[PDB]
Design a protein around this ligand. Sequence first.
Ligand SMILES: O=P(O)(O)C(O)(Cn1ccnc1)P(=O)(O)O
Ligand SMILES: C=C(C)CCOP(=O)(O)OP(=O)(O)O
Ligand SMILES: [Mg+2]
Ligand SMILES: [Mg+2]
Ligand SMILES: [Mg+2]
Lengths: 324, 283
Amino acid sequence: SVSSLLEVVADDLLKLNNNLKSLVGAENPVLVSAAEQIFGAGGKRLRPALVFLVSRATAELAGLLELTTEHQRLAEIIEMIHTASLIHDDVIDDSGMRRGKETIHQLYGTRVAVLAGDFMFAQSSWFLANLENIEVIKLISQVIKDFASGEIKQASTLFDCDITLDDYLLKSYYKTASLIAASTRSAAIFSGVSTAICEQMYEYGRNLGLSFQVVDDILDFTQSAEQLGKPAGSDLAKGNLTAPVIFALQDEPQLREIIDSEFSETNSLATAIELVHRSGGIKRAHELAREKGEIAIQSLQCLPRSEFRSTLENMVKYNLERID
Amino acid sequence: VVADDLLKLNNNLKSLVGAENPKRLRPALVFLVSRATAELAGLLELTTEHQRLAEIIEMIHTASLIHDDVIDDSGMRRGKETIHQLYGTRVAVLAGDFMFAQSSWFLANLENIEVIKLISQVIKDFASGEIKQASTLFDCDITLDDYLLKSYYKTASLIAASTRSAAIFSGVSTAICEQMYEYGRNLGLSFQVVDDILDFTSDLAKGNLTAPVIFALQDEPQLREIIDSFSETNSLATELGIKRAHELAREKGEIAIQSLQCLPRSEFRSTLENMVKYNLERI
Ligand SMILES: O=P(O)(O)C(O)(Cn1ccnc1)P(=O)(O)O
Ligand SMILES: C=C(C)CCOP(=O)(O)OP(=O)(O)O
Ligand SMILES: [Mg+2]
Ligand SMILES: [Mg+2]
Ligand SMILES: [Mg+2]
């Protein structure tokens, strides 16, 4: 249960959840309702939780009695950047279901959804500049660039089966892992801990996020749309060749033709899907997630033994057992 | 896309620094306000923050137009994928994001939190207001101040921020910087309402009733009638106001000129003074 997993920082999340409503304002009922749609749809709030967990462990190590106001704002900032990414991702992937509810672009047109994401990006970087830490300012600005860089790169290698796993991990760093890595390090920065601790907190966030996206790519093959709350079996059909396919593409070369066919033949997608399950593609991709999770756990031993650290120890083990 | 705007900008800024020795509008304002405030502060050359502020602003302006043209398909139950391939939707949003991201990334690397607070604010209200623009179309109940505010967020606010951050990067007094925000706001409004005139002389066909139409809809007893709807379909000529539309810009323009009087006599302060005059010269 994600509820029990995030128990030690449950109270911190409830303050954030009651606060995202006003995080955009009230002058614009369209933008307000567009935000209530995706915020109220029921996200997992995993990115604010890790910020909360890292902020507390590194605050105990630094002698702070409570959390700074910039800790609690940072958690609201990362979630709003994550939300802005999802909005722009759905317009890109032509997805009509997010978190069990209809996506914004199919309610208010693609333009308003794009502007809502543009607003959420500038809004978070505006809050972030008001936190006055210049180092976090540049770090998060790098992440906003990484989301666009990965999406342009992911859009240009579709149906290209000679894509390497090296490219696949770099792509998933840009669009998913860079934000999570910057959020865990920026939390350590607002606690004032040493540079080495700052660096290892960033290394936990990038490796947990890397395996997190690998699992997100697995659940597209192994879970239903109703289960995930978002369209399932969509990456392969669009030409986005995730780790199960790249692993599978090494032994069963019939995949190459079907994907280079752009699945034009009727029945081709159904047979290509079973060719992925045919091979050890799904399980070989899972062990890539386990390895990325192994590196993430090692970065935690720099911290003392605390239930904040052991929850952060549990969050990768929860990733490998997650049906979403 | 991003790499192409910087090229013709790096060249256009040189074509002006060469002309100053003995679109293109936004970095010209940054360049001339940068040097005017620079010589006042004892800076013998434009710093790097001034040079890369000019490309920051145009990248925001250009990325704005790209995202503003994203298609509305709300009530489309036909072929969504066909119109998006036809109008390059997925390409437009990705390039606009990357241009928006590289701009704030440049801005973040300048290590001035006051400019970052100001610029991100400009983008924020641009996105919010453009979401709200759907309602104000076909609405009789806007005042002249409500029009100047939508026209601020649309264009004028970005120009005012560019001219004040140019003064901030010269490290001069905050009163001269505040006067530099005032040069841009006004010239921006004065530039927006003169653009709103040029089209009508369609923008009301979609429902954008600018300052000409609000100086009307007052005298013109009805007017609201026609815009209340298809109707007589004729009379869609207009009525036609413009006297209070070429004077509205003339008044804002002389407020911008008045803000330049804190700067000493210089070839940049006079070129900036001629910027307002050249905007009204299109009459
Ligand atoms: O599969 P995607 O990477 O597009 C996704 O994980 C979202 N996303 C977008 C960028 N990083 C992650 P989602 O499946 O939620 O649609
Ligand atoms: C980066 C991608 C994988 C986001 C989707 O997974 P999440 O589980 O993090 O999305 P929400 O719960 O917040 O809706
Ligand atoms: Mg995607
Ligand atoms: Mg997607
Ligand atoms: Mg996915």
